[PDB]
Design an enzyme around this catalytic site. Structure first.
Site, mmCIF file in Angstrom:
data_model
loop_
_atom_site.group_PDB
_atom_site.id
_atom_site.type_symbol
_atom_site.label_atom_id
_atom_site.label_comp_id
_atom_site.label_asym_id
_atom_site.label_seq_id
_atom_site.Cartn_x
_atom_site.Cartn_y
_atom_site.Cartn_z
ATOM 1 N N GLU A 116 0.828 -1.204 0.000
ATOM 2 C CA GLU A 116 0.000 0.000 0.000
ATOM 3 C C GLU A 116 0.864 1.257 0.000
ATOM 4 O O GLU A 116 0.665 2.166 -0.799
ATOM 5 C CB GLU A 116 -0.895 0.012 1.238
ATOM 6 C CG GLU A 116 -2.275 -0.535 0.986
ATOM 7 C CD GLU A 116 -3.153 -0.546 2.229
ATOM 8 O OE1 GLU A 116 -2.696 -1.055 3.272
ATOM 9 O OE2 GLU A 116 -4.305 -0.054 2.162
ATOM 10 N N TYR A 144 -12.821 28.341 4.941
ATOM 11 C CA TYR A 144 -12.751 26.961 4.460
ATOM 12 C C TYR A 144 -11.390 26.655 3.789
ATOM 13 O O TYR A 144 -10.751 25.640 3.998
ATOM 14 C CB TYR A 144 -13.979 26.625 3.540
ATOM 15 C CG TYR A 144 -14.523 27.702 2.595
ATOM 16 C CD1 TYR A 144 -13.750 28.188 1.537
ATOM 17 C CD2 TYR A 144 -15.857 28.124 2.673
ATOM 18 C CE1 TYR A 144 -14.277 29.048 0.584
ATOM 19 C CE2 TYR A 144 -16.393 28.977 1.728
ATOM 20 C CZ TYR A 144 -15.593 29.431 0.674
ATOM 21 O OH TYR A 144 -16.092 30.220 -0.331
ATOM 22 N N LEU A 177 -6.102 5.058 9.236
ATOM 23 C CA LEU A 177 -6.936 6.164 8.789
ATOM 24 C C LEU A 177 -7.299 6.897 10.063
ATOM 25 O O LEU A 177 -7.526 8.097 10.049
ATOM 26 C CB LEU A 177 -8.219 5.640 8.118
ATOM 27 C CG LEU A 177 -8.138 4.927 6.759
ATOM 28 C CD1 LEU A 177 -9.536 4.654 6.218
ATOM 29 C CD2 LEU A 177 -7.351 5.804 5.792
ATOM 30 N N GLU A 178 -7.350 6.135 11.159
ATOM 31 C CA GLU A 178 -7.670 6.628 12.509
ATOM 32 C C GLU A 178 -6.621 7.635 12.968
ATOM 33 O O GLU A 178 -6.930 8.605 13.671
ATOM 34 C CB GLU A 178 -7.693 5.461 13.510
ATOM 35 C CG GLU A 178 -8.939 4.602 13.476
ATOM 36 C CD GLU A 178 -8.765 3.369 12.609
ATOM 37 O OE1 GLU A 178 -7.918 3.395 11.693
ATOM 38 O OE2 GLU A 178 -9.479 2.369 12.841
ATOM 39 N N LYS A 221 -11.502 4.968 2.033
ATOM 40 C CA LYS A 221 -10.591 4.298 1.110
ATOM 41 C C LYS A 221 -11.529 3.582 0.139
ATOM 42 O O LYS A 221 -11.929 2.441 0.366
ATOM 43 C CB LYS A 221 -9.746 3.259 1.844
ATOM 44 C CG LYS A 221 -8.309 3.641 2.125
ATOM 45 C CD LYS A 221 -7.635 2.523 2.922
ATOM 46 C CE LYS A 221 -6.267 2.922 3.462
ATOM 47 N NZ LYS A 221 -5.417 1.768 3.897
HETATM 48 N N1 LIG Z 1 -16.465 30.235 5.684
HETATM 49 C C1 LIG Z 1 -16.331 30.976 4.613
HETATM 50 N N2 LIG Z 1 -17.368 31.532 3.912
HETATM 51 C C2 LIG Z 1 -17.216 32.301 2.788
HETATM 52 O O1 LIG Z 1 -18.158 32.798 2.188
HETATM 53 C C3 LIG Z 1 -15.837 32.558 2.256
HETATM 54 C C4 LIG Z 1 -14.838 32.014 2.976
HETATM 55 N N3 LIG Z 1 -15.084 31.207 4.169
HETATM 56 N N4 LIG Z 1 -13.449 32.189 2.633
HETATM 57 C C5 LIG Z 1 -13.070 32.925 1.459
HETATM 58 C C6 LIG Z 1 -14.206 33.527 0.642
HETATM 59 C C7 LIG Z 1 -13.601 34.359 -0.514
HETATM 60 O O2 LIG Z 1 -13.936 35.712 -0.415
HETATM 61 C C8 LIG Z 1 -13.411 33.705 -1.905
HETATM 62 O O3 LIG Z 1 -13.610 32.312 -1.823
HETATM 63 C C9 LIG Z 1 -11.942 33.905 -2.359
HETATM 64 O O4 LIG Z 1 -11.650 33.459 -3.657
HETATM 65 N N5 LIG Z 1 -15.517 33.356 1.017
HETATM 66 N N1 LIG Z 2 -9.778 -0.016 10.585
HETATM 67 C C1 LIG Z 2 -8.725 -0.014 9.807
HETATM 68 N N2 LIG Z 2 -8.024 1.105 9.443
HETATM 69 C C2 LIG Z 2 -6.927 1.096 8.623
HETATM 70 O O1 LIG Z 2 -6.309 2.108 8.324
HETATM 71 C C3 LIG Z 2 -6.443 -0.207 8.058
HETATM 72 C C4 LIG Z 2 -7.141 -1.290 8.449
HETATM 73 N N3 LIG Z 2 -8.301 -1.197 9.331
HETATM 74 N N4 LIG Z 2 -6.796 -2.627 8.034
HETATM 75 C C5 LIG Z 2 -5.701 -2.856 7.131
HETATM 76 C C6 LIG Z 2 -4.924 -1.624 6.684
HETATM 77 C C7 LIG Z 2 -3.734 -2.079 5.805
HETATM 78 O O2 LIG Z 2 -2.504 -1.743 6.377
HETATM 79 C C8 LIG Z 2 -3.893 -2.111 4.265
HETATM 80 O O3 LIG Z 2 -5.246 -1.940 3.908
HETATM 81 C C9 LIG Z 2 -3.484 -3.513 3.745
HETATM 82 O O4 LIG Z 2 -3.471 -3.656 2.350
HETATM 83 N N5 LIG Z 2 -5.272 -0.369 7.121
#
Ligand SMILES: Nc1nc(=O)c2c([nH]1)NCC([C@H](O)[C@H](O)CO)=N2
Ligand SMILES: Nc1nc(=O)c2c([nH]1)NCC([C@H](O)[C@H](O)CO)=N2
Ligand SMILES: Nc1nc(=O)c2c([nH]1)NCC([C@H](O)[C@H](O)CO)=N2
Ligand SMILES: Nc1nc(=O)c2c([nH]1)NCC([C@H](O)[C@H](O)CO)=N2
Ligand SMILES: Nc1nc(=O)c2c([nH]1)NCC([C@H](O)[C@H](O)CO)=N2
Ligand SMILES: Nc1nc(=O)c2c([nH]1)NCC([C@H](O)[C@H](O)CO)=N2
Ligand SMILES: Nc1nc(=O)c2c([nH]1)NCC([C@H](O)[C@H](O)CO)=N2
Ligand SMILES: Nc1nc(=O)c2c([nH]1)NCC([C@H](O)[C@H](O)CO)=N2
EC number: 4.1.2.25
Lengths: 121, 121, 121, 121, 121, 121, 121, 121
Positions: free
Chosen positions: H22, H54, H73-74, H100
């Site tokens: 992986e 954002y 992932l945790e 995933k």
């Molecule tokens: N939370 C949030 N709401 C908005 O309306 C917002 C924001 N955050 N961040 C930047 C933005 C901007 O003025 C334009 O996206 C910039 O290109 N607008």
């Molecule tokens: N619950 C959970 N979270 C993971 O990140 C995770 C998992 N379970 N199981 C196997 C794994 C592995 O390392 C790869 O998917 C194996 O290919 N990753």
């Protein structure tokens, strides 16, 4: 009371945004509006006058989404919630979700946005 | 109890709506039905007689969605909820969502609708 | 020459259609426009003046799709093809596809429509 | 002549299929019909009488898809093509695509089907 | 505690169902499994041994979905929930959703199914 | 002759690929098979014996996609085309498309693949 | 020869465009590349050296899509086609499709773009 | 307080995972981040300084998703939640979902993952 009236994926082309370039070019704003409304009388009667007309709600959202450009999505949702709560007493609470699926953010994502819930006073 | 039986995206062509033009032409109505039902006995037994048959539920929704045209979606969901609660005692509560993805509203949206929740008395 | 300029899934709310009820209520019309244009000079130069500006094309389609209601989709595509061929000499041929995803047809389908191809004379 | 009239993703619940179990339970059949028709007169005139009415075509496909159960998809497409070519002289050629998105095949696929093209004699 | 481990849209071809024709032909069963598990230790440690391995869970669901044909979806979800709760002590509660997107029901819908939630004792 | 029999989006989990890590972990391979077959006799007769059984074709593709791991997609499509052309004389030509929607390529794309067309000799 | 190697829906965040605001903010560019390549030797041999490595092609497209901002999509596709034809003799012809799903055009559409086809000399 | 700021379907190509193969090849990680933030002041003022940007949040998620490869992932969600809670006092609680869609699991599913919710202390 879990009854609701909804309007999903409304889309408008506006020029809001805090960046000058955003206001210049504009973008598509996606809006989801969910209204808490007791729909039992209307269900019983079947009279359109006993419920909130989705069409009129769409016209209010539209007028705000396609009107004067503002900076925040928070400001746009707050004006919609306030506008809907104001004209409809049957709406106990209004939920507004605005999504910028294509903001000026260098990256791969489905969208960014905000969601507010406002009870009708 | 969080167990549920569901029927998603049922679609029917009907003529409901408060506008004369709507009743004339008609449209597609999308219906989502979620029933609160304790499914542990059926899970234990595996006997179809210990649960609610989704098929029969679809026939009830169908008969109401494809029957006499009414004005409101509220009226249609109220007849479905009432009809399902009435014939099934195992259904503790019924949730009905109706969506008009293409109403006579000049605009771009994914759909408009209502949702009701009715406990079985 | 297989080069093309395209505009996909343009959507407009109009009132065309041969049925009186259609013109009254209206619906969403989906439009796909594909233009045959030799894009090698523009590719070489990178000058917008050596190609057809998609934006201007969208404005022409729009003005016809959101203007006077007609009966046929055939009539709407014929006016768009003709309008685009007329203003642009670089467009060797124009393809117009119009789709009524929600016509007054009792049934389950993704949509109905027509497609025409018109060479620029 | 590249003009076409189309009907996409028509869906019907039928009982065709060579397996007895198939005819008993049934399934959803998806149908795409594309007709070769010169649409220039209609585009010029805007008169519905100068083209083929999609609605009537859907009724023909429907009557065959929701009628007597047969074994092959080939047999169903051949009856539709033949039926459409027969009633419409303006249709120079008919293309019929039938898809069984859920046949009795143990596996993961989007669907299986056939497509035929039949010129009108 | 709102932490969860999930497996969405698992799909298996099985022969369950109360109808003889169903068991004969079979169909695709869609399964969504959500496990309540406190993931803070694993998040802290990053050691796979401090959480539930999604892979092993998929193998358990699989063995039940692709094994002996039963009548109810309720019976299949009850065996999966029970099987997962049994082997994993870290799973405080298991939610199982099974969906028959294509049952022997004459109609247009996205699917039908059941969902159960079972706390680990 | 434009008639065709098709199998779309077949998906198999295999271990092909030129990278050792690929063969170890494996991935989902998407396969689209289109066969050129004159379907008029079958359409006339409705006898399954006058056409190629999609089911049997899926079994051939499957056996190659879920069998011994190879390096190239080109090698897998060449064995499928060859295998189908070999057992079916009614298949005038076979088209095989294989897609690796998730190869070991650092990036954002819908997929990569190859497509071959092989006439039956 | 109908064999092809393909790369679909590649997506990059770039700053091309004829408008100053576009270059400032940027957007997502979607790219589809189809290469005409005789794949029979590779199919026979299974040796990666007898075909064009999709990965290397993605790196070339990437370097051009994520490099210096230009005005036209025509200029970007012309550099990609030219770059791929130049390094690969096995590629008989290269097709490049670039799509701006979100250009500065006030409206509702799925996207706009251009497509070029260039034979390898 | 039900107000939220969100970032959906963020996608990054990383090399995390407990399997050596992986980490070598890598994969696409999908991330959904939902922040609990009282948005009323910003809605009132319309000043970007009264809310969480954002864009800055996406940069934090990105730096962790595209940085050093970890096993779980945790572990990745715990670093993101912790990183966002740490820099923003206005964020009352952070929800992180990592998916995933294509892990090394032999099967057909839409994806596997985990979701954590962390209140800001
Ligand atoms: N939370 C949030 N709401 C908005 O309306 C917002 C924001 N955050 N961040 C930047 C933005 C901007 O003025 C334009 O996206 C910039 O290109 N607008
Ligand atoms: N619950 C959970 N979270 C993971 O990140 C995770 C998992 N379970 N199981 C196997 C794994 C592995 O390392 C790869 O998917 C194996 O290919 N990753
Ligand atoms: N809330 C709500 N439910 C309805 O069923 C409804 C409605 N509001 N407003 C108008 C309407 C109409 O009769 C048609 O949509 C008009 O074309 N039907
Ligand atoms: N081929 C074709 N094009 C059309 O525009 C058309 C048509 N056929 N048939 C009926 C129709 C109607 O006026 C409305 O759909 C009726 O509700 N419009
Ligand atoms: N090519 C082709 N067309 C069919 O209609 C067909 C077919 N091939 N093979 C089997 C079959 C069956 O009768 C049912 O699918 C069996 O469950 N129907
Ligand atoms: N609720 C519920 N669960 C089932 O598994 C079920 C069911 N209801 N009704 C009928 C059925 C059947 O045996 C087949 O669908 C009949 O074709 N299976
Ligand atoms: N054209 C082409 N076909 C393949 O099957 C192929 C390929 N190109 N390039 C690399 C590769 C590899 O062995 C794995 O993708 C490496 O991770 N397989
Ligand atoms: N055909 C065509 N290709 C382009 O790359 C292009 C174009 N037409 N028209 C305008 C444009 C602009 O510079 C930006 O879209 C303006 O916001 N770029």
């Amino acid at each position: 009371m879990q009854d609701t009236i909804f309007l999903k994926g409304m889309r408008f082309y506006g020029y809001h945004g805090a960046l000058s370039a955003e206001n210049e070019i504009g973008q598509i704003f996606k809006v989801d509006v969910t209204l808490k409304v007791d729909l039992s009388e209307a269900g019983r009667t079947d009279n359109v006058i006993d419920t909130v007309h989705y069409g009129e709600v769409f016209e209010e959202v539209k007028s705000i989404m396609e009107g004067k450009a503002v900076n925040l999505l928070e400001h746009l949702a707050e004006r919609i919630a306030n506008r809907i709560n104001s004209q409809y007493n049957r709406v106990m609470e209004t939920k507004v979700r605005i999504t910028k699926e294509n903001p000026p953010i260098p990256g791969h994502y489905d969208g960014v946005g905000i969601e507010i819930v406002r009870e009708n006073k």
